């Protein structure tokens, strides 16, 4: 009643162990992974454009502006690097270091997990003047690497096309809505990165590009809401090995929304970077306020929830060796991320507040009126 | 340049991909995994007592009185079964379907990841009248399996002793509090299971056992507050392949706490079981009220969030093939769980109210107070 599953065999034996489930969520994790492989080329500074296309046959194509996955032979394995990448469960090396990378995702490079769980996979590489092609199916090579033609231009890059295996996912098909949502997210987290979504079926096409990045992301969060000031603030900075990006904006409403990210993956339960943000923001507001005489009688302006009212913000950090609560996602634990965020946002917020006095007053003013409202509801509720 | 990592080599090459990080959380996941292996025997019905002892040298011993990991040879590999389970990255088969299992552990069986990340591991098996022993170090056999004597009093079971690899975690050491916390949780989730913690480093002892299960869990969740009744309700039932257990109590206070679990692991982001719980509870509560004539007309209408004030409950389900939203689990997606919790809870709850009309209307009126209190705070705030 027992056997050893070697390599990709294990992935097909227990798919849920690699993608959580075999439903709609798991189906799209394949898309996210291949997309993140492309996004990693952008993070490294080689890709500037990424195309995601839903083909009429249900398959999905992800093409990048990158270097193109290497096709030269790996001595130890006696096979092209691109073949090894998509056929071995876990491959690594120093190539994992030297640039920020998307965190979480599928086992190892993740690409081979997608291949194992796909009826067919086609990898095309434009590199060193040629257009290469290798085809797989459920983890195995069906068509060995070969040159199918010459590369145009100075065109280099990788184009991956795959179709999740119906033997595992049933009649599931890609959902344009979900694909667009992740593309919209990425464009925001990698400002300047152009991502195009093509849905051949409906002949639709949308471009996702935003130089404003996270600041724009913050405004996007307050879509149907009256803004306190139409221009969202952007805080950029680097501390140690951590790149920090924070964007925020206020609305005259009373709802809030703070999204946090670590290496391009949502961190629902926050972590060191989120706690460092709330803290730094609080430090800055209060400090500035006193200096400028915005506080009278020493009212209860803080209390955290008061400052959160009508606050829309996005905190994003990038760091090597990220540490998560468990299973590479959820809550960021790196203390250095906390120090980076706190450091970068505190100093910069002070400046932003000083050069934008009116706005600073309105937001601090809103915090006081929020505290009072809290007080009134408390007594009222503690009356009956 | 590229390196293919075969088997356990990949675990030591990149531990965070298997345990999330190499700090305190990752360290304890090793403990959680070995404990889960023992608990699986209890879930299968062959184990009643698990001992967890923190040794003075930092190693952790986990002993269960279950069947004992088999030691016969696996012809396909030419090694005893115990060896295979602890030294191969992924082994599986029909044994995975024997019964309910703890979900979301470490890769595959999980034990081999622990072994790979420990400077040493000793596995003792009491089976078929004999006491077997086999030792490992960083994923590899150091002392092959051998019989070291008779099984004392013919007992059967597995005793695992291991020490997380200092080269991976530095000077970190198991935290008794984290251990007791998980042991307490498990005692509640598997009512009747007895777990003993011996903290030799502090000469301590402690028993975790509670036939009250999830009901007691709800009670202890509300420790500190005055209850509306000190006897927790217990709803248990099986619908399809899903076993459900829900416990709940009410306090005179205003705070609330609802914990959910799927196959022994916390689902902080809810899922089908949670949604179904509140719907079944809400339907049974509002229907009973109408039936017994409690829905007055001279006031506000009780809604969600109103009937969950001062309500402490724990919703726990066990089912085969759990489906989560990939990630770090977080949300249960199986529609069968929802129908299971709904069916089982709704009906049983209906009888609870009819059998406790006193408490029944005491709960409804409490929802009424919360309704007005909620609208009193609204008025107050809109008044600013
Ligand atoms: C799924 O494959 C991904 C890539 O995905 C995409 N879409 O381009 C990308 O995320 C990243 O791609 C890399 C990662 C590292 C190098 C990299 O180190 C290069 N540098 C070299 O000089 C080089 C040249 C030839 C060669 O055989 C190797 C080692 C082989 C590798 C990295 C597969 C390296 C290079 O030219 O391309 C690279 C590329 C395209 O990592 C992979 C391979 C897992
Ligand atoms: C890390 O080991 C764990 C176990 O932990 C402990 N402490 O018991 C436990 O969680 C579960 O333990 C099982 C799981 C299934 C069977 C099981 O199916 C049994 N039934 C047999 O008749 C049997 C007899 C000989 C044999 O080689 C095998 C299959 C081999 C196995 C389960 C490793 C099965 C049995 O005797 O013991 C079993 C045991 C002890 O699964 C493991 C092996 C991954």
From Swiss-Prot, chains A, B:
It catalyses: ATP-dependent breakage, passage and rejoining of double-stranded DNA. GO terms for biological process: DNA topological change; DNA-templated DNA replication. Its main location: cytoplasm. GO terms for cellular component: chromosome; cytoplasm. Optimum temperature is 65 degrees Celsius. Active between 25 and 77 degrees Celsius. Residues 1-214 are annotated as: ATPase domain. Its EC number is 5.6.2.2. Its cofactor is Mg(2+); Mn(2+); Ca(2+). Binds two Mg(2+) per subunit. The magnesium ions form salt bridges with both the protein and the DNA. Can also accept other divalent metal cations, such as Mn(2+) or Ca(2+). GO terms for molecular function: ATP binding; DNA binding; DNA negative supercoiling activity; metal ion binding. It comes from the Bacteria. The keyword Zinc does not apply. It is found in: Cytoplasm. Keywords: ATP-binding, Cytoplasm, DNA-binding, Isomerase, Magnesium, Metal-binding, Nucleotide-binding, Topoisomerase. Residues 215-384 are annotated as: Transducer domain. Heterotetramer, composed of two GyrA and two GyrB chains. Non-hydrolyzable ATP analogs induce dimerization, novobiocin also induces a small amount of dimerization. The two subunits form an intertwined dimer where the GyrB ATPase transducer helix of 1 subunit connects to the Toprim domain of the other GyrB subunit through a 10 residue linker. In the heterotetramer, GyrA contains the active site tyrosine that forms a covalent intermediate with the DNA, while GyrB binds cofactors and catalyzes ATP hydrolysis. Belongs to the type II topoisomerase GyrB family. For the electron microscopy studies a GyrB-GyrA fusion protein was made with a Gly-Asp-Leu linker between the 2 subunits. It forms the expected dimer. Few gyrases are as efficient as E.coli at forming negative supercoils. Not all organisms have 2 type II topoisomerases; in organisms with a single type II topoisomerase this enzyme also has to decatenate newly replicated chromosomes. Consists of 3 domains; the ATPase domain (residues 1-220), the transducer domain (221-390) and the toprim domain (391-634). Removal of the N-terminal ATPase domain (residues 2-392) increases ATP-independent DNA relaxation, showing it is not required for DNA binding or cleavage, this enzyme still has some supercoiling activity, but in this case it introduces positive supercoils. A type II topoisomerase that negatively supercoils closed circular double-stranded (ds) DNA in an ATP-dependent manner. It probably also catalyzes the interconversion of other topological isomers of double-stranded DNA rings, including catenanes. Relaxes negatively supercoiled DNA in an ATP-independent manner. At comparable concentrations T.thermophilus gyrase does not introduce as many negative supercoils into DNA as the E.coli enzyme. This is DNA gyrase subunit B. The chain holds residues 7 to 390 of 634 of the full protein.
């Amino acid at each position: 009643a027992i056997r050893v599953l070697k390599g990709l065999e294990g992935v097909r034996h227990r798919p849920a162990m690699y993608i959580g489930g075999t439903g709609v969520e798991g189906y799209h994790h394949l898309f996210k992974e291949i997309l993140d492989n492309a996004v990693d080329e952008a993070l490294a500074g080689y890709a500037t454009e990424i195309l995601v296309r839903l083909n009429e046959d249900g398959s999905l194509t992800v093409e990048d502006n990158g270097r193109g996955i290497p096709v030269d032979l790996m001595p130890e394995e006696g096979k092209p690097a691109v073949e090894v990448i998509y056929n071995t469960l876990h491959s690594g090396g120093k190539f994992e270091q030297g640039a920020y990378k998307v965190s979480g995702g599928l086992h190892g490079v993740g690409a081979s997990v997608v291949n194992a769980l796909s009826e067919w996979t086609v990898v095309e590489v434009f590199r060193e003047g040629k257009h290469h092609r290798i085809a797989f199916s459920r983890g195995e090579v069906t068509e060995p690497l070969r040159v199918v033609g010459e590369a145009p231009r100075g065109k280099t890059g990788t184009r991956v096309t795959f179709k999740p295996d119906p033997e595992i996912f049933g009649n599931l098909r890609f959902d344009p809505s979900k694909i667009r949502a992740r593309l919209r997210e990425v464009a925001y987290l990698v400002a300047g990165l152009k991502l195009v979504f093509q849905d051949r079926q409906h002949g639709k096409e949308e471009v996702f590009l935003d130089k404003g990045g996270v600041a724009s992301f913050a405004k996007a969060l307050a879509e149907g809401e009256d803004l306190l000031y139409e221009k969202p603030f952007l805080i950029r900075g680097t501390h140690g090995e951590v790149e920090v990006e924070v964007g925020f904006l206020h609305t005259q409403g009373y709802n809030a929304e703070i999204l946090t990210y670590a290496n391009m993956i949502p961190t629902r339960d926050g972590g060191t970077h989120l706690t460092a943000f709330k803290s730094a923001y609080s430090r800055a507001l209060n400090q500035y306020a006193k200096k400028a005489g915005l506080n009278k009688e020493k009212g209860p302006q803080p209390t955290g929830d008061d400052l959160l009212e009508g606050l829309y913000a996005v905190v994003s950090v990038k760091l090597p060796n990220p540490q998560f609560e468990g299973q590479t996602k959820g809550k960021l634990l790196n203390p250095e991320a906390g120090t980076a965020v706190g450091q970068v946002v505190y100093e910069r917020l002070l400046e932003i507040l000083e050069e934008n006095p009116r706005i600073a007053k309105a937001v601090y003013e809103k915090a006081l009126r929020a505290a009072q409202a809290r007080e009134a509801a408390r007594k009222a509720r503690e009356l009956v």
